[PDB]
Design a binder for this molecule. Structure first.
Ligand code: DPM
Ligand code: MG
Length: 281
């Protein structure tokens, strides 16, 4: 019987769903995979619980803090470009923006980092899908907008990237550029098929980034950057918590043994909490 992938109708969701689908068929010759369109990720998980679906593809940023009984995140694929992208028709990068320029972003994480470096900037809300966001930019509603580099590259929109904002300039959200896969824990047929898609290097990084995030707070509603490289077998984790208006920014660093990756994040988060990260709310 065909393996079903629960996915939204959005271009990004459809791409990620097809990515795993193709990856599955490449690793397992003769395997049948099909996509089930749906309609707040709860609806996706219910379908898997109701046996209307097998696995679901998520961006690691959008993976919830709590998994319903019977489910969980068992796989993390090879990571794409983790950092933010600067998108403007009239400008190249951040420092080329005039004082009081209008930069659309709905992300508390991206906003707090911009106001920190340049408080002068006027930050306006940005909503809609990827195409809708670009549509507003061409309408002159913004001087510039900031989108994830991964999303644009996967949509072949890569020409819309004027400059790559480095992790130093803007710290990526937890698991940004990383694609995770969720399924039924006790489904061994699926667990065994999703095993080759798992990237060990990427896995330890994101699972380290998560533990840091989880300790502080959940979801994307909170202005928290979480990003980790790995140098050889050593994991370098950087975390960020700050005021949305760019008042104060609390940064931290730690360097890992590869095995303690989950323990690193929870310790660094506790380290920041003692440094005033708790008072930020
Ligand atoms: C977690 C929250 N979701 C949104 C939009 C979002 N989520 C995932 C992606 C793709 C990147 C990836 O695959 O890792 C995107 C698109 C994007 O532009 O990042 C974002 C907020 C975007 C916004 O315009 O506000 C994040 C919030 C965050 O990153 O802080
Ligand atoms: Mg989209």
């Amino acid at each position: 019987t065909p393996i079903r992938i629960a996915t939204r109708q959005s271009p990004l969701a459809l791409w990620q769903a097809n990515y795993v689908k193709d990856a599955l068929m490449a690793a397992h010759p003769g395997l049948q995979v099909e996509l089930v369109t749906m309609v707040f990720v709860k609806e996706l998980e219910i379908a898997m619980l109701e046996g209307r679906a097998d696995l679901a593809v998520h961006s690691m940023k959008d993976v919830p803090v709590d998994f319903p009984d019977g489910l969980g995140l068992v796989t993390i694929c090879e990571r794409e470009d983790p950092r933010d992208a600067f998108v403007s028709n009239t400008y190249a990068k951040i420092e080329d923006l005039p004082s009081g320029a209008i930069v659309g972003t709905c992300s508390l994480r991206r906003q707090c980092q911009l106001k920190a470096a340049r408080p002068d900037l006027v930050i306006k809300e940005l909503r809609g899908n990827v195409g809708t966001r670009l549509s507003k930019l061409d309408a002159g509603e913004y001087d510039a907008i900031i989108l994830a580099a991964a999303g644009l590259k996967r949509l072949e929109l890569e020409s819309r990237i004027r400059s790559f904002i480095e992790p130093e300039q803007s710290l990526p959200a937890v698991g940004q550029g990383a694609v995770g896969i969720e399924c039924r824990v006790n489904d061994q047929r699926v667990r065994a098929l999703l095993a080759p898609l798992n990237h060990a290097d990427t896995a330890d990084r994101v699972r380290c980034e998560r533990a840091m995030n989880l300790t502080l707070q959940g979801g994307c509603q909170v202005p928290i950057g979480s990003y980790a490289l790995l140098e050889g077998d050593t994991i370098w984790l950087r975390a960020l918590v700050g005021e949305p208006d760019g008042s104060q920014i609390v940064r931290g660093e730690i360097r890992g043994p590869r095995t303690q990756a989950e323990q690193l994040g929870i310790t660094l988060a506790e380290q920041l909490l003692s440094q005033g990260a708790k008072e930020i709310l």
